Amino acid sequence: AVLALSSDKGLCGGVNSFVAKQARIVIKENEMAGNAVQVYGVGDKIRSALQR
Amino acid sequence: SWMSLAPFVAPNNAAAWRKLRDGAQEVQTVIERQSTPGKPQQIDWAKWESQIAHKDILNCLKTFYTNQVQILDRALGALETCEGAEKGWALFDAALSACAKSVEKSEELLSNGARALWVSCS
Amino acid sequence: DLKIVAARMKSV
């Protein structure tokens, strides 16, 4: 279970960008070995970043 | 009324149905077209006999025209009053019998369902 | 033109 903390407003630089980058890295690393991943999040920015 | 028989078609009996449909559509597209204006052509040789100077082949052409139009109206009034078709009307009657049998057993099914509902409610 | 540049300057 990956808990990604983020914000709800924009103009925050690229902090949510780096967060979602690390989260993508972790997910793609842990889904190869076969570990079933779940995603919890805080803020709409991570949702918009990882939806598609 | 037989044109509302579509939804009882199946995909195994689709192309045939479509063929029949297009046939009838062709027929009607003929008929309405060739009976909507009626007769607006009705050419008048008084104009062309004057407007043309030869008047030697025009005469034979007009003779041909009135000789073909005579036989056309003749055939028309003649048809405007067998066995070759009964050999297919027998197939049609067999189809009607099969359809009635299918409707009969389906009505039996629905009657049994209604009987079940009556029994349950009573 | 002028209207475009003036509106842009105002907004910015």
Binding site: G10, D44, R47, S48 | R18, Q25 | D1, K3
Partner: protein, 281 residues
Amino acid sequence: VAATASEAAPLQFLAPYSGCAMGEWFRDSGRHCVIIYDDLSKQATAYRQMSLLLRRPPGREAYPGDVFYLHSRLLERAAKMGDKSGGGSLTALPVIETQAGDVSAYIPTNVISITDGQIFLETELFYKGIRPAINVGLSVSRVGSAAQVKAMKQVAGTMKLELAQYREVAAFAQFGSDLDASTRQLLTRGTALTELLKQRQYSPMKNSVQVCVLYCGVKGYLDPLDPKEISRFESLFIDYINANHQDILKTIETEKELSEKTEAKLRAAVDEFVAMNEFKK
């Protein structure tokens, strides 16, 4: 009526009046007509050229002042006559090329100020994928629904409303925010309609077929479907209704309305079509 560039200035200056003269025969003789002036700015160029070589003094943008009386004479010949003068008509569809989208100029302003509507065309919409690239916000028609079939009124009112809402909301929506379903439906329907109104060149369609297609688009038989699939949904539905349901089209062409019978028949045909076919959603 070809008054090309090698053709002298007076011929370029006379060609649209010659076209109106050829059209007044139809307008007066009980018949109808349409006239398309293409490159109506070259007429004003030629008038400028003539007046400047005749030593007449210019105005603004080196044009004379008689440009309004150059276009008014021409466009006031378009008209719809009464039942005593035959009942004819002469429609007009002038064409204008702007530069950098500048419609604050002189000739565009005059012609917009002396016409019963506008059809704007943009390159941003032409390259985004919307072809014809008609901006339906700026584009108007003062006549409006009176020049529209009832069957088309019913659909096009809703269509205009939905497209207004979509145009309002999509700009904010594109920033990656997360919206409710009542707004997601607006975006979906607007995208569907925007993908419906695209057309190939030299591929026009009948009014009944437009009505049927926009019915499919307005009643929600394209919302779940993918945007990229509508370009073939449209053609397959067109072929389907042209093949097996010409009678509905003839009925719409004759009655020029949508009774409940035709409504139900069209809905059933669309349902049959979606059953018979499969798309990406």
